[PDB]
Amino acid sequence: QNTLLKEAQDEISNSIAKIDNLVLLLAKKLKERLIDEFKYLKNNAQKLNLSRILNIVDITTKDGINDILREIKFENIKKIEELKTNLSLKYDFLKDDFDNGFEGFKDGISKNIDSIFQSEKFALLRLKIEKNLKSDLYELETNLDTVIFDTFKEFKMSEILNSLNINGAFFEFLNDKLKH
Known part of the structure; x- marks a missing residue:
């Protein structure tokens, strides 16, 4: 029991010691929109391409x-490695996996909500841009509007990542309490 307490203290000490992707995705969506506009310029003035443009957001x-x-x-793999490290309590190690999964589901739901708001804003901006569009000027206006949208997506990524890190810290604290 004393050895298990020492191992738990060491694990607590280790826990104490130890956005750009969204911007890249928004840039890829802007490039896809530009390609669709170029295709519509090879043809003439397709609304079906404009409707399809919204799917790049999805x-x-x-x-x-x-x-x-x-x-x-990756977090689950790290938790499995930590459980393998020192054999103090197996049931307690198994217990926190459901809490970690619930935290991951909550993070995914927050991502869905915030990114859906961002995608709706981007769709509104694209609809406003569509509202005959001299082509190069339209591409520049899109490069500004989707720039604002990419900034919003990066902010969403940063805030949701902070929330996910807080949830992971809470799950680690719960696992430490279970080990105690």
Whole structure:
């Protein structure tokens, strides 16, 4: 029991010791919109392409969700390694996995909400830009509007990542309490 308490203290000490992707996704969405505009310029003035443009936002949201899921998987692997490190309590180690999964689901839901607001804002900006559009000037106006949208997406990524880090810290504290 004394050895287990020492191991728990060491784990607590280790825990005490130890946004750009969203911007890249927004830039990719802007590039896709520019490619669609160029295709519409090769043809003439397609509204179906404008309707399809909104799907690039969903693609970018899916990419962000994939990044978040990869981070969650890495956190789970780290938790498994920590459980393997020293054999003090196996049931307590198993218990916190559900809490970690719930925290990851909450982070994913927050990402969905904030990124959906950002995607709706980007769609509104694109609709405003569409409202015959001399092409190069339209591309520059899109480069400004989607720039504001990319800044909003980066802010959403930063805030949601801070919230996810806080949730992970809370889960680690709960695991430490269970070990105690």
